[PDB]
Swiss-Prot record, chain A:
Disulfide bonds: none annotated. This is Flagellar basal-body rod protein FlgG. The gene is flgG. The chain holds residues 59 to 104 of 260 of the full protein. The basal body constitutes a major portion of the flagellar organelle and consists of four rings (L,P,S, and M) mounted on a central rod. The rod consists of about 26 subunits of FlgG in the distal portion, and FlgB, FlgC and FlgF are thought to build up the proximal portion of the rod with about 6 subunits each. It is found in: Bacterial flagellum basal body. Belongs to the flagella basal body rod proteins family. Transmembrane segments: none annotated.
Swiss-Prot record, chain B:
The chain holds residues 2 to 67 of 134 of the full protein. It is found in: Bacterial flagellum basal body. One of its GO terms (biological process) is bacterial-type flagellum-dependent swarming motility. This is Flagellar basal-body rod protein FlgC. GO terms for cellular component: bacterial-type flagellum; bacterial-type flagellum basal body, rod. Belongs to the flagella basal body rod proteins family.
Length: 46, 63
């Protein structure tokens, strides 16, 4: 009555799709310079 | 009849072929499971018998 479905399905393999960057917030280290700036939050210079 | 030798040898060859086929089938189904209708697979053997026509050939009644 109840048996296994008896079906075949062969895989092929694995491929890399993407590399996501963790755009988190990094720590701030003091360089004591007067012409260095750091971003707090989001945003990029141009 | 001096010609029943061929019959005896042919029966022996057929019986040996049957036994070899059964052994090969068992080896193929060594690690099988859930055959048709779900009943588990069970191994089988053959039984040789002689044809008392005295001296006679070999036969396999059933598996």
């Amino acid at each position: 009555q109840t048996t296994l479905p008896s079906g075949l399905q062969i895989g092929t393999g694995v491929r890399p799709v993407a590399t996501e960057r963790l755009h988190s917030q990094g720590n701030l280290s003091q360089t004591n310079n007067s012409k260095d700036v750091a971003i707090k939050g989001q945003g990029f210079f141009q | 009849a001096l010609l029943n030798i061929f019959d005896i040898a042919g029966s022996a060859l057929a019986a040996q072929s049957k036994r070899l086929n059964v052994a090969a089938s068992n080896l193929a189904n060594a690690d099988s499971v859930t055959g048709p209708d779900g009943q588990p697979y069970r191994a089988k053997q053959v039984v040789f018998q002689v044809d008392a026509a005295a001296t006679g050939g070999v036969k396999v009644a059933s598996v």
